[PDB]
Design an enzyme around this catalytic site. Structure first.
Site, PDB file in Angstrom:
ATOM      1  N   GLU A 114       0.889  -1.012  -0.033  1.00 52.37           N
ATOM      2  CA  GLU A 114       0.093   0.115  -0.030  1.00 52.37           C
ATOM      3  C   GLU A 114       0.942   1.178   0.021  1.00 52.37           C
ATOM      4  O   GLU A 114       2.130   1.145   0.251  1.00 52.37           O
ATOM      5  CB  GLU A 114      -0.943  -0.094   1.192  1.00 52.37           C
ATOM      6  CG  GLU A 114      -2.007  -1.196   1.133  1.00 52.37           C
ATOM      7  CD  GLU A 114      -2.860  -1.023   2.360  1.00 52.37           C
ATOM      8  OE1 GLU A 114      -2.806  -0.124   3.239  1.00 52.37           O
ATOM      9  OE2 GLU A 114      -3.916  -2.005   2.421  1.00 52.37           O
ATOM     10  N   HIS A 122       4.483   0.664   2.288  1.00 56.40           N
ATOM     11  CA  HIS A 122       4.419  -0.145   3.018  1.00 56.40           C
ATOM     12  C   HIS A 122       3.836  -1.579   2.672  1.00 56.40           C
ATOM     13  O   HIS A 122       2.800  -1.607   1.799  1.00 56.40           O
ATOM     14  CB  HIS A 122       3.986   0.293   4.602  1.00 56.40           C
ATOM     15  CG  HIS A 122       2.622   0.560   4.386  1.00 56.40           C
ATOM     16  ND1 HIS A 122       2.154   1.746   3.777  1.00 56.40           N
ATOM     17  CD2 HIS A 122       1.391  -0.021   5.007  1.00 56.40           C
ATOM     18  CE1 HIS A 122       0.868   2.111   4.010  1.00 56.40           C
ATOM     19  NE2 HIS A 122       0.482   0.865   4.700  1.00 56.40           N
ATOM     20  N   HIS A 124       1.549  -4.800   4.206  1.00 58.03           N
ATOM     21  CA  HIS A 124       1.160  -5.588   5.537  1.00 58.03           C
ATOM     22  C   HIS A 124       1.130  -7.057   4.890  1.00 58.03           C
ATOM     23  O   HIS A 124       0.840  -7.538   3.969  1.00 58.03           O
ATOM     24  CB  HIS A 124      -0.513  -5.237   5.189  1.00 58.03           C
ATOM     25  CG  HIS A 124      -0.917  -3.965   5.591  1.00 58.03           C
ATOM     26  ND1 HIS A 124      -1.021  -3.584   7.023  1.00 58.03           N
ATOM     27  CD2 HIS A 124      -0.837  -2.860   4.848  1.00 58.03           C
ATOM     28  CE1 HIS A 124      -1.210  -2.268   7.150  1.00 58.03           C
ATOM     29  NE2 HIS A 124      -1.260  -1.538   5.684  1.00 58.03           N
ATOM     30  N   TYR A 205     -11.354  -5.070   5.278  1.00 61.89           N
ATOM     31  CA  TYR A 205     -10.765  -4.244   5.101  1.00 61.89           C
ATOM     32  C   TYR A 205      -9.629  -4.003   3.774  1.00 61.89           C
ATOM     33  O   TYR A 205      -9.555  -3.367   3.003  1.00 61.89           O
ATOM     34  CB  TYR A 205     -10.099  -4.374   6.503  1.00 61.89           C
ATOM     35  CG  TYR A 205      -8.827  -3.090   6.730  1.00 61.89           C
ATOM     36  CD1 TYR A 205      -9.343  -1.737   7.102  1.00 61.89           C
ATOM     37  CD2 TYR A 205      -7.500  -3.324   6.926  1.00 61.89           C
ATOM     38  CE1 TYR A 205      -8.382  -0.659   7.044  1.00 61.89           C
ATOM     39  CE2 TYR A 205      -6.793  -2.206   6.830  1.00 61.89           C
ATOM     40  CZ  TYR A 205      -7.239  -0.984   6.843  1.00 61.89           C
ATOM     41  OH  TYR A 205      -6.197   0.278   6.967  1.00 61.89           O
TER      42      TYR A 205
HETATM   43 CU   LIG Z   1      -1.663   0.185   5.234  1.00 63.15          CU
END
Ligand SMILES: [Cu+2]
EC number: 3.1.21.-
Length: 248
Positions: A114, A122, A124, A205
Site C-alpha cells: 500500500e 509499506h 501488510h 478491510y
Molecule cells: Cu497500510
C-alpha cells in the site's frame, strides 16, 4: 460471479475466524554522510533463484490484476521497487518458517502493498496457522526484522561504504522497520500481541482499498496483493469489491 471471485470468497470465508499475526514491512528515509537513501533505493535484482522466482510471481500478479479498460500510469520505477519488495518480504517470511520447521502449506498468509498518506510505501502481512501461537508474536517480529534489514542492505542500490551498510542495517532494526500489531497501551506498560481474524480482515478491510493507478500514488491505495492460496492475487479492483460483497 466468476469462478475466481467465488473461489476467493469461499477460501476467505473458510478462514474467517483464523487467528493470525499482523505485521507491516516498511522503510524510512535515511541520509548517511550526504547520501540519500529513499523508499525506492533498493532496486538491485539479486540473482538468487528463489528471489527471482518470487519477483516473477509479483510481476505476473500485477499483470493479471491490471484493468486495461482503464489506463495505468504508475511510474515504472515504482512498480519495479514494489515487485522487488514483494520478493524480499516473502523471502523473510519463508526464512523464518524454515527456522521453525513449518511446512509452508500449513501456513495461511496474505500480503498487500500500500501507499500511506504519511509513510508512503509499506506492506501488510497477515500470517498464522496451527504452528503459530500468540506468545510467539514478538519473536516473529524480531526475526522478521533481522532478515528484512539484512535483505534491504543487500538490495540497496546506493553505493555505500561497509560502515554505512552496517549503519543502515542497525537503523532498520533499531527503528523497527517491521512492526507487529499490539493492543493500544502506555509507553512504559507492556504491549501484548494482537492477533487478528484472517478472512474477516481481508474481506472487510484490505479488499476495500482503492487501486493505485497513478504516480504519485493515491493516499491509502493498494498496489498489489497475494495470498497463500493464490486466491486474491489476480483479482481486479472491481472483483475484490465483489468478493467483500459476497463474503457478507
Ligand atoms: Cu497500510
Amino acid at each position: 460471479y466468476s469462478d475466481e471471485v467465488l473461489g476467493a470468497t469461499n477460501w476467505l470465508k473458510e478462514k474467517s475466524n483464523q487467528e493470525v499475526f499482523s505485521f507491516v514491512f516498511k522503510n524510512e528515509n535515511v541520509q548517511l554522510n550526504g547520501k540519500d537513501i529513499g523508499w525506492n533505493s533498493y532496486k538491485k535484482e539479486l540473482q538468487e533463484d528463489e528471489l527471482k522466482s518470487l519477483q516473477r510471481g509479483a510481476e505476473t500478479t500485477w499483470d493479471q490484476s491490471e484493468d486495461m479498460e482503464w489506463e495505468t500510469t504508475v511510474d515504472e520505477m515504482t512498480k519495479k521497487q514494489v515487485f522487488i519488495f514483494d520478493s524480499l518480504v516473502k523471502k523473510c517470511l519463508f526464512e523464518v518458517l524454515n527456522t521453525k520447521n513449518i511446512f509452508p502449506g500449513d501456513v495461511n498468509w496474505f500480503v498487500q502493498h500500500e501507499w500511506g498518506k504519511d509513510q508512503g510505501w509499506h506492506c501488510h502481512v497477515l500470517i498464522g496457522g496451527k504452528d503459530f501461537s500468540q506468545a510467539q508474536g514478538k519473536w516473529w517480529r524480531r526475526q522478521l526484522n533481522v532478515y528484512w534489514s539484512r535483505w534491504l542492505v543487500t538490495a540497496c542500490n546506493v553505493q555505500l561504504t561497509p560502515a554505512e551498510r552496517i549503519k543502515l542495517r542497525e537503523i532498520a532494526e533499531d527503528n523497527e522497520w517491521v512492526t507487529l500489531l499490539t493492543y493500544k497501551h502506555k509507553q512504559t506498560k507492556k504491549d501484548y500481541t494482537k492477533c487478528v481474524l484472517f478472512g474477516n480482515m481481508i474481506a472487510y478491510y484490505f479488499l476495500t482499498k482503492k487501486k493505485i493507478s497513478t504516480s504519485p500514488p493515491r493516499d491509502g491505495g493498494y498496489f498489489l496483493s497475494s495470498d497463500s492460496g493464490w486466491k486474491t492475487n489476480f483479482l481486479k479492483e472491481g472483483e475484490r469489491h465483489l468478493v467483500s460483497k459476497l463474503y457478507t
